[PDB]
Amino acid sequence: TIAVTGSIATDHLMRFPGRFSEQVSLSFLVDDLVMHRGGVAGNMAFAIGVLGGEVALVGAAGADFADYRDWLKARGVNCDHVLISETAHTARFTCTTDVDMAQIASFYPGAMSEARNIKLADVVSAIGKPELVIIGANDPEAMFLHTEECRKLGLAFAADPSQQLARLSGEEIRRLVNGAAYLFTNDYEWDLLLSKTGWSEADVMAQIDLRVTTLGPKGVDLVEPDGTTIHVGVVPETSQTDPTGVGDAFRAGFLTGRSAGLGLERSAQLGSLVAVLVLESTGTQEWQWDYEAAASRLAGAYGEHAAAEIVAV
Amino acid sequence: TIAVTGSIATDHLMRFPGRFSEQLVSLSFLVDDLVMHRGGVAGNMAFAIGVLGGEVALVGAAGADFADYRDWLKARGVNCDHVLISETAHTARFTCTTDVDMAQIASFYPGAMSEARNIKLADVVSAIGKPELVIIGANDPEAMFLHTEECRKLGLAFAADPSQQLARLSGEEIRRLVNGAAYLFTNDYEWDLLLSKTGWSEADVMAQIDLRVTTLGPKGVDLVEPDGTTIHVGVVPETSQTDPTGVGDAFRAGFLTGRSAGLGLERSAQLGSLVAVLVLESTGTQEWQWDYEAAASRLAGAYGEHAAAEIVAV
Ligand SMILES: Nc1ncnc2c1c(I)cn2[C@@H]1O[C@H](CO)[C@@H](O)[C@H]1O
Ligand SMILES: Nc1ncnc2c1c(I)cn2[C@@H]1O[C@H](CO)[C@@H](O)[C@H]1O
Ligand SMILES: Nc1ncnc2c1c(I)cn2[C@@H]1O[C@H](CO)[C@@H](O)[C@H]1O
Ligand SMILES: Nc1ncnc2c1c(I)cn2[C@@H]1O[C@H](CO)[C@@H](O)[C@H]1O
Ligand code: NA
Ligand code: NA
């Protein structure tokens, strides 16, 4: 029922056992190199499926996507509407993370550029109207066209530009916001969005139903247009390792909770749990779902009643 | 016969259509090119020496994925008999993004390279005679040290070529790699860093080596003898530069091939300059092509018809 649009990628994740704060010819001797499934839509679809949601992945990959497809389908993700390029290869994200969880990365779009040829009308015709479509980081034209299709067909959507906010222009960003049921960013991305669009906090809130702003170690804010604000602190980490995909994980947990009928605070607590589980894994989809560990850490952070309510659904 | 020790790698080379100088931590570069190529300093130098017609043996550590690389190098005359193939590790991986101004941001995962420390140059000598020259290139640090020590004890002339690993090695580690070298190869930044980290002066270094070779990017190369005798060779000017990866390896290979062919220092450096610009004008370090006529033409344009004729003769 949730249609996740955005990048599908292979992540090449490396660990630099030093600090980027020190330091043109930058060279980092890394002590770990692993290749994992990635892309924001891949990550969010994977998490929603693992959590038991009904989710369809809508993006563009290369012909190398068969194993990824099996991996996602095994966890309930509908991959029928993944466009497979006959010529391009699946996008490649390459990232080096340092001791302080800082990151230096490159992204090669490849097949992602063909997402602009996807029509959400076909997905609707094939599996009904989605209850929510996530307009995630993607081919910029695909992001715009997907948002426009949502506006035209009456589909509720979540604006989730994250990684692509730096590459989109102010007008391109303004075109992605109006009418969104949700706006997802981190706090840096929130400030950058405001600065690039020229909009004020109020200008933005007048156009959306809810602003969700993640705050890294300080948790997340959920802000309604009338100023009503819920702050949810983190599920504190105990073995953080790589911050790649943490935002995707939070969005997936949160939206799965909402789809299950939980309130904003409870859904955000679930999102916080999934986010820390990703933070404590290298790959974005390398985390494991343990019901008991989930209940325990949720209870430790938010209370037994909150944990019980969350794990019930 | 030249024995090239150093890294064997797969290079993942990307092009950023912007300037790192502007983005100057959560750096993200949208790149418009991504290609995977054969690399490693020893791979590159051995490949270039083989393409130029030299007798060259590659001595390094790769993973079990090395079969196609092995065929690629053997097809160019390279002896790969003494490449150690790790039973468990994978071939090292270099990942690099180059911007519009040829600046680079890169990561290097050693992997199987770490096992080079298990290689005995005594076996290479026993198998193919004493090498004319052993290149101690960027490698597993312990392998670099042990290779230099084995050259010293077996009486093999060697070239200190630490380049990329100079930042990793400590001052004492660097000092242990220099004494007795027939050649010291660095670029100018690496030269200054070597001096600062070892605490040695220019004179301290020159007292221990037979020749200093310092590349200068667009300003060419200096070849400096211990008595101060200096040859400066300007570049073969580029016309389609694209990626600077492997340019130093290419220069070293052309230069040493010229020396092995009996050319003087200036002529050998002119040949090295040619190979270096050909690599600069290719993406991968071994993606360049040897064209005899284009070589003669650009050599002549840069250095004179007689110099070009002398070089291309050998
Ligand atoms: N510019 C982009 N456009 C689309 N997707 C992007 C990027 C970048 I920068 C990284 N990624 C993907 O985001 C995931 C982590 O959130 C990772 O899995 C990674 O693949
Ligand atoms: N649950 C947690 N507990 C403690 N710190 C957290 C988290 C989470 I989710 C994120 N972080 C910090 O925020 C950045 C990545 O989002 C990184 O800087 C990371 O350290
Ligand atoms: N630290 C290192 N140790 C050994 N080899 C290294 C590095 C680094 I940084 C890059 N390379 C290799 O050098 C080649 C270009 O000269 C490229 O082909 C690349 O594979
Ligand atoms: N043959 C040439 N003609 C002009 N410039 C050259 C060369 C060569 I070999 C190197 N360079 C300069 O060095 C940088 C890469 O090392 C390059 O980015 C460039 O600044
Ligand atoms: Na992660
Ligand atoms: Na190159």
Swiss-Prot record, chain A:
How activity is controlled: the entry says: The enzyme is subject to substrate inhibition by adenosine and is competitively inhibited by the adenosine analog iodotubercidin. Unlike other adenosine kinases it is not stimulated by inorganic phosphate. Activity is stimulated in the presence of potassium. Is inhibited by a series of 7-(het)aryl-7-deazaadenine ribonucleosides bearing small and bulky substituents in position 7; some of them display micromolar antimycobacterial activity and low cytotoxicity.
Q: What protein name applies here?
A: Adenosine kinase
Record pathway: Purine metabolism; AMP biosynthesis via salvage pathway; AMP from adenosine: step 1/1
**Note from the entry:** Was identified as a high-confidence drug target.
Q: Which GO terms describe its molecular function?
A: adenosine kinase activity; ATP binding; dGTP binding; GTP binding; magnesium ion binding
Q: Which GO terms describe its cellular component?
A: plasma membrane
Q: Which reaction does it catalyse?
A: adenosine + ATP = AMP + ADP + H(+); adenosine + GTP = GDP + AMP + H(+); dGTP + adenosine = dGDP + AMP + H(+)
Family listed: Belongs to the carbohydrate kinase PfkB family.
Q: Could you tell me which residues carry N-acetylthreonine?
A: T1
Protein species of origin:
Mycobacterium tuberculosis (strain ATCC 25618 / H37Rv)
UniProtKB/Swiss-Prot annotation, chain B:
Q: Which GO terms describe its biological process?
A: AMP salvage; purine ribonucleoside salvage
Q: What CDD domains does the entry give?
A: ribokinase_group_A (cd01942)
Tell me which residues bind ATP: N187, T215, L216, G217, P218, K219, G220, G248
The PTM N-acetylthreonine maps to: T1
An example of a GO molecular function for this protein is: dGTP binding
Location of the active site = D249 (proton acceptor)
Name what cofactor the protein needs.
Mg(2+)
Q: How is its activity regulated?
A: The enzyme is subject to substrate inhibition by adenosine and is competitively inhibited by the adenosine analog iodotubercidin. Unlike other adenosine kinases it is not stimulated by inorganic phosphate. Activity is stimulated in the presence of potassium. Is inhibited by a series of 7-(het)aryl-7-deazaadenine ribonucleosides bearing small and bulky substituents in position 7; some of them display micromolar antimycobacterial activity and low cytotoxicity.
**One Pfam family this sequence matches:** PfkB
GO-annotated cellular components: plasma membrane
Subunit annotation: Homodimer.
Q: Tell me more from the record.
A: Was identified as a high-confidence drug target.
Q: What is this protein called?
A: Adenosine kinase
**Naturally occurring in which organism (per UniProt):** Mycobacterium tuberculosis (strain ATCC 25618 / H37Rv)
| Upper classification of the organism | Bacteria, Bacillati, Actinomycetota, Actinomycetes, Mycobacteriales
